[PDB]
Amino acid sequence: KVFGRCELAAAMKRHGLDNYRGYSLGNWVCAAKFESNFNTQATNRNTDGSTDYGILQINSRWWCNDGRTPGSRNLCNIPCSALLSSDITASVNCAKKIVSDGNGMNAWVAWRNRCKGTDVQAWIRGCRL
Ligand SMILES: [Cl-]
Ligand SMILES: [Cl-]
Ligand code: NA
Secondary structure: OEOOHHHHHHHHHHOOOOOEOOEOHHHHHHHHHHHHOOEOOOEEEOOOOOEEEOOOOEEOOOOOEOOOOOOOOOOOOOEHHHHHOOOOHHHHHHHHHHHOOOOHHHHOHHHHHHOOOOOHHHHOOOOOO
16 A cells, blocks of 8 residues: 555554654654555665565564574564565554663664655645544
């Protein structure tokens, strides 16, 4: 599924992400735009052999099992394919564990390089929330 901007804001809010660990909703929408262009089916392979999955591009070396990243952890206890569903619940629940682990949203390179320190409320402007 390719989400709209306000459609995704509303789903993320419903799932408890607005102000989760102090990050306003616009931070989460901005990160999903530059990580996946709002496409739940996005995958990208990294040099170390791991793969990033779904709307927030969650990595198989630490967070999910894809059966081809040797020595990897499955800290969200899910198959990586569950992160590609049109239902974002699994992605959201796993992202809450990542952002809680000490480094906040700096875990998402595109958030660090393209959202951090910008007017991120612009990403939810105009939406009926
Ligand atoms: Cl915001
Ligand atoms: Cl933080
Ligand atoms: Na893994």
